[PDB]
Amino acid sequence: MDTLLILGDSLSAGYRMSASAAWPALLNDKWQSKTSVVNASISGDTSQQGLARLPALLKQHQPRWVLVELGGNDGLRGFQPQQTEQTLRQILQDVKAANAEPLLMQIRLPANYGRRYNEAFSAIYPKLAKEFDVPLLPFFMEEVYLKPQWMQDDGIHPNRDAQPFIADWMAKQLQPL
Ligand SMILES: [Cl-]
């Protein structure tokens, strides 16, 4: 079996829920005996904190692909987009140099954040996917935001009931990869 490594923040770890409640556990169950899914996600992680954890994970897991789901905390904290871009660039360099295929997820801030900064933050992702010639996955939360029954009260993080949707959505996005 090949291994999919997830390098993520609470959108993949689960916000205020157990790891086993989060969609990557559901995906792992769905892909039993075919593909291993390692959820190396930490609630609250910046792109810099993800990057710090990455080398040990690459060594240990020798994954075939790495899903990079990071930078949203940087954006939510108003960090400079150029800085989050460089950090993400380093993550992508590390992945390729370990002989793994990076899969970069587009991240955005919710629709009530100011539009100029959200635009500059969001733009980093297609720029990096083009630069590294890697898949750019769409942001799964854009669908989730549209369902109050799947959102926690902060308007940011998906709830436990959203997790089976997200797992199914991710299974569908990831099969041609
Ligand atoms: Cl998107």
Side-chain angles (χ1 to χ4, degrees):
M1 297 173 286
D2 290 320
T3 296
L4 170 65
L5 179 62
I6 305 170
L7 185 77
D9 50 30
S10 76
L11 295 180
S12 302
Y15 187 68
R16 307 178 155 242
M17 63 191 76
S18 72
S20 79
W23 65 265
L26 291 158
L27 188 62
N28 190 67
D29 279 354
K30 175 150 53 217
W31 285 357
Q32 183 167 352
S33 302
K34 300 195 287 283
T35 308
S36 168
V37 181
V38 173
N39 195 8
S41 297
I42 299 200
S43 286
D45 256 21
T46 64
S47 65
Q48 188 177 148
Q49 290 169 309
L51 175 59
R53 297 186 293 103
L54 179 60
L57 297 164
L58 289 172
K59 213 178 165 193
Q60 169 174 169
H61 301 284
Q62 287 215 124
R64 186 149 131 110
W65 322 267
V66 179
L67 179 64
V68 179
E69 182 270 300
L70 284 169
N73 288 320
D74 306 43
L76 289 165
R77 295 173 200 178
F79 290 179
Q80 291 290 153
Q82 115 211 274
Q83 297 294 310
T84 300
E85 180 178 317
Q86 184 54 39
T87 303
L88 290 172
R89 179 173 288 112
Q90 295 177 203
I91 292 167
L92 294 169
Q93 288 162 351
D94 287 2
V95 177
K96 269 171 133 196
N99 239 270
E101 291 173 29
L103 311 176
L104 179 64
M105 186 172 289
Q106 174 76 58
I107 306 298
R108 300 188 196 272
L109 314 185
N112 79 150
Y113 280 74
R115 277 145 141 180
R116 204 251 249 161
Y117 175 92
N118 191 3
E119 292 176 354
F121 168 76
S122 297
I124 80 184
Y125 297 89
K127 177 181 169 184
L128 292 165
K130 191 160 194 271
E131 177 176 302
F132 285 79
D133 192 30
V134 296
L136 182 66
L137 279 72
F139 190 32
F140 66 72
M141 283 304 297
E142 290 294 333
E143 314 249 283
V144 183
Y145 291 151
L146 299 176
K147 293 296 210 283
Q149 68 266 44
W150 291 348
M151 291 298 305
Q152 301 190 34
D153 321 306
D154 58 24
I156 293 167
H157 306 278
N159 72 14
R160 290 173 181 78
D161 286 350
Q163 304 300 309
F165 169 75
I166 300 163
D168 287 345
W169 182 99
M170 290 296 319
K172 294 185 305 175
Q173 284 290 326
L174 285 163
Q175 92 162 12
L177 328 163

